[PDB]
């Protein structure tokens, strides 16, 4: 209450603590933060989005994330939206993004894992889930999260975009689909390779601000930005990172259990009887998170040096916790 306001003073900062805000908001981190983010950015005035209409949509959306899922609940969506909101304000990207694009990125982050069941794309495919069948085994969950988020905008009471242009609604729809689809981990290497190529030919106005010529280059940076926000736990303060690490291992171990019950092959990192939580996080930083953040940092330097320091430091805490 007074605690909520104290915590939201950190809204524009990486150091924001999303657990605390959930505790001070009747367990509505995502509504809480989306509302804070949208007032902070004047998005409601700019796009003539009624306040009531926005709250009802956000509340419904949060309710569609599942509370009995360890990691992929409304707290995570709120984290990615907040992380994303800070990254959009990085100095190197200053006057680069239209208000529509900014709106699309934060909306994308908000809905990006909605209705997630606490199991991977691979599991849904191997068990012949209705979702895998619906989606022909390709970005199964990701296609689903989009389908749900765009469905909920259909009833006029929740169409936060009622007042955009037709041409504006389409461009947003195109951008959001593109960004959520890019959170699919199977596409990570392809995305990281492309990010490295964009860094190679990077250009700036002279004031250390990137020159991103039309749609292609702009959506590529937004794709990677939301993907970075989604893989941002290990760049956050250690107290936060450990709670996030603990929640993701609870989700995985539950999957390992659901896998075992059914005689399926259990995947090593989902095996509670063999998986080292610590080695597991070190591998995650070495082979996935650091290579990505190292490249993001190159693109916006030196805006993300602090983050790389924290990362390299959290990496060592986990290393030092293994014999
Ligand atoms: C804080 O630790 C983690 C946080 C998020 C993730 C995910 C990845 N990559 C799991 C997969 C998820 C997805 O594709 O649905 C995206 C997020 C994975 C994490 O760690 C994994 C499991 C243990 C080490 C690697
Ligand atoms: Mg996801
Ligand atoms: Zn996610």
From Swiss-Prot:
Entry function:
Hydrolyzes the second messenger cAMP, which is a key regulator of many important physiological processes. May be involved in mediating central nervous system effects of therapeutic agents ranging from antidepressants to antiasthmatic and anti-inflammatory agents.
In this chain, 3',5'-cyclic AMP is annotated as bound at: 72, 281, 284
Q: Where is the active site?
A: 72 (proton donor)
Enumerate the spans annotated as PDEase domain.
1-323
Source organism per entry reads Homo sapiens
The residues listed in the UniProt record as binding Zn(2+) 2, with positions renumbered to this chain, are: 113
What residue range is the signal peptide?
A: none
Tissue-specific expression: Expressed in brain, heart, lung and skeletal muscle. Expressed in white blood cells.
Q: Which family does it belong to?
A: Belongs to the cyclic nucleotide phosphodiesterase family. PDE4 subfamily.
Q: What is this protein called?
A: 3',5'-cyclic-AMP phosphodiesterase 4B
């Amino acid at each position: 209450e007074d605690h909520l306001a104290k915590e939201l003073e950190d809204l524009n900062k990486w150091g924001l603590n999303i657990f605390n805000v959930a505790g001070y908001s009747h367990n509505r981190p995502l509504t809480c933060i989306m509302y804070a983010i949208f007032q902070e950015r004047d998005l409601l005035k700019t796009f003539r989005i009624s306040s009531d209409t926005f709250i009802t949509y956000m509340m419904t959306l949060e309710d569609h994330y599942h509370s009995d899922v360890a990691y992929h609940n409304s707290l995570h969506a709120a984290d990615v939206a907040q992380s994303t909101h800070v990254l959009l304000s990085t100095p190197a990207l200053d006057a680069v993004f239209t208000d529509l694009e900014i709106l699309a990125a934060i909306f994308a982050a908000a809905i990006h894992d909605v209705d997630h069941p606490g199991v991977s794309n691979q599991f849904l495919i191997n068990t012949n889930s209705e979702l895998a069948l619906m989606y022909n085994d390709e970005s199964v969950l990701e296609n689903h999260h989009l389908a749900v988020g765009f469905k909920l905008l259909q009833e006029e009471h929740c169409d936060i975009f009622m007042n955009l242009t037709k041409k504006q609604r389409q461009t947003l729809r195109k951008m959001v689909i593109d960004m959520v689809l890019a959170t699919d981990m199977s596409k990570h290497m392809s995305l990281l390779a492309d990010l490295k190529t964009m860094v190679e030919t990077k250009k700036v106005t002279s004031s250390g601000v990137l020159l991103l010529d039309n749609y292609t280059d702009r959506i590529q940076v937004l794709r990677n930005m939301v993907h970075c926000a989604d893989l941002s736990n290990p760049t956050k303060s250690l107290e936060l990172y450990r709670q996030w690490t603990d929640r993701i291992m609870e989700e995985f171990f539950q999957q390992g259990d659901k896998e075992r019950e059914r005689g399926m092959e259990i995947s090593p990192m989902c095996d509670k009887h063999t998986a080292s939580v610590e080695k597991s996080q070190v591998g995650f930083i070495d082979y996935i998170v650091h290579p990505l953040w190292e490249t993001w940092a190159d693109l916006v330097q030196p805006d993300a040096q602090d983050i790389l320091d924290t990362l390299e430091d959290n990496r060592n805490w986990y290393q030092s916790m293994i014999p």
